[PDB]
C-alpha cells in the first residue's frame, strides 16, 4: 500500500507547481488524484473564511522545524480526522512554497521529510485503522 | 502565529470532514 514519502512529494510537486516552480529545483528526491483535488477543495473552503496560508505563516530558517511542528501538534491536539489530513498536507505545501517566495528554498526537502516522518509516525496508525488511503479515496471520489 | 493557524486549519479540516463523513 501507500509509500507517505511518495504521497507527500506529488503533493507538494503539485502546490509548488501551483506557484510556477519544479519540485526538481529543489529537490533530488487515485489516492494521489484524491488528495491533489481534496488539497484544492480545502484551500478553496479555507480562503471563503480566512486569509490563503500562504500569507499567514512567519517563516524563518532558524525556527521552521519548531513552527511547523506546534502547528501540527494543535491541529491534531484533540484527535485525527481525514479533514485534518487534508489541512496537514496543504499546511506543508503552504509552507514550502512560501519557504521558495522568501528565499529559503533549502527548507522544502526538509519539510517534505518533516511531513513524511510525522504521516509515518504518527499518522499512520490512525490511517491502518481508518482502513487506509482506499476509505480517502471511497469518501472523497 | 503558529496556534492560530493550526486553529484554522483545524476549523475548514472539520467542516471539511464533515461535508465527506
Known sequence: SQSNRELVVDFLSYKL?????????????????????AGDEFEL?????????????????????????????????????????????????????????????????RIAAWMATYLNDHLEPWIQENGGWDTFVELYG | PEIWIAQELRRIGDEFNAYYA
Not at chain 1, 507547481?17 to 483535488?37: C, H, I, N, P, T
Not at chain 1, 496537514?88 to 512560501?98: I, R, W
Open chain 1, 17 to 37: 507547481s501551483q506557484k510556477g516552480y519544479s519540485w526538481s529545483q529543489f529537490s533530488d528526491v487515485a489516492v494521489k488524484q484524491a488528495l491533489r483535488e
Open chain 1, 45 to 109: 473552503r479555507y480562503r471563503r473564511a480566512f486569509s490563503d496560508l500562504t500569507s499567514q505563516l512567519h517563516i524563518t530558517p532558524g525556527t521552521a522545524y519548531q513552527s511547523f511542528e506546534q502547528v501540527v501538534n494543535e491541529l491534531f491536539r484533540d484527535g485525527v480526522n481525514w479533514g485534518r489530513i487534508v489541512a496537514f498536507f496543504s499546511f506543508g505545501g503552504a509552507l514550502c512554497v512560501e519557504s521558495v517566495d522568501k528565499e529559503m528554498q533549502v527548507l522544502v526537502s
